[PDB]
Amino acid sequence: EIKHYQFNVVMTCSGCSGAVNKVLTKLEPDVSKIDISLEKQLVDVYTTLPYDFILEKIKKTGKEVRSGKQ
Amino acid sequence: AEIKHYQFNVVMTCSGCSGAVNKVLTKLEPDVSKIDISLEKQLVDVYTTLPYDFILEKIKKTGKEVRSGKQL
Amino acid sequence: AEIKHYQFNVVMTCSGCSGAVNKVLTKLEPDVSKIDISLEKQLVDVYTTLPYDFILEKIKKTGKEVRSGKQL
Numbered sequence: 001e002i003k004h005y006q007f008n009v010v011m012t013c014s015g016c017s018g019a020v021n022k023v024l025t026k027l028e029p030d031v032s033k034i035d036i037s038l039e040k041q042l043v044d045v046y047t048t049l050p051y052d053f054i055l056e057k058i059k060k061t062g063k064e065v066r067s068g069k070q
Numbered sequence: 071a072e073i074k075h076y077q078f079n080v081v082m083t084c085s086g087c088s089g090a091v092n093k094v095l096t097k098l099e100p101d102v103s104k105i106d107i108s109l110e111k112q113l114v115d116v117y118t119t120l121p122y123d124f125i126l127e128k129i130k131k132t133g134k135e136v137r138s139g140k141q142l
Numbered sequence: 143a144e145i146k147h148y149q150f151n152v153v154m155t156c157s158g159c160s161g162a163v164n165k166v167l168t169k170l171e172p173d174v175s176k177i178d179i180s181l182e183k184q185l186v187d188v189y190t191t192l193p194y195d196f197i198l199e200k201i202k203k204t205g206k207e208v209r210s211g212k213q214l
């Protein structure tokens with residue numbers, strides 16, 4: 001069953017937000033929906049996959065993850 | 071009253087880096103009378119009545135590394 | 143004589159990051175004869191007489207992460 005996670009990630013330019021998009025996009029179709037706002041610095045993910053698995057994938061980009069939740 | 075001149079050597083690699091610093095500083099008008107950011111020289115010059123530390127902390131909320139700062 | 147070819151996987155996120163890498167390596171001309179940088183593939187190709195670990199260090203100094211490096 002599809003779960004919903006939201007991370008608060010420090011993204012400064014459109015390259016930062018693109019980099020996060022990129023790694024989530026590789027997880028399609030297990031990620032069914034991606035929604036990112038540079039300006040509010042938020043990342044929303046709809047997937048079947050574990051929080052912990054998505055937390056790591058996103059930090060791998062080297063962008064600071066301030067906070068998470070489900 | 072007195073306008074202080076501060077310089078920061080801030081790690082800034084694209085114009086997002088430098089724009090994010092810019093944005094936090096412009097928020098502090100009317101107490102900032104001049105902001106000179108040079109993305110090319112990785113320098114941030116601020117003229118302001120505010121104390122150094124308060125300015126420093128506003129810059130660091132961007133997440134960009136501040137290599138050094140000084141009051142001129 | 144040898145003109146050596148090095149390839150590094152470097153975490154370049156926007157064209158500021160790749161441009162930061164390009165600038166450190168163009169400061170090494172003409173010892174560096176050719177530079178091909180691929181933002182897309184995250185790769186930096188250097189043709190040079192300088193030794194491998196000297197080029198590696200220069201790229202590290204930019205602060206962008208180097209995942210891997212090799213001589214071909």
Ligand SMILES: [Cu+2]
Binds near residue numbers: 013014084086157159
């Ligand atoms: Cu950028």
Ligand SMILES: [Cu+2]
Binds near residue numbers: 012014016
């Ligand atoms: Cu960026």
Ligand SMILES: [Cu+2]
Binds near residue numbers: 083084
């Ligand atoms: Cu940047």
Ligand SMILES: [Cu+2]
Binds near residue numbers: 084157
């Ligand atoms: Cu960048």
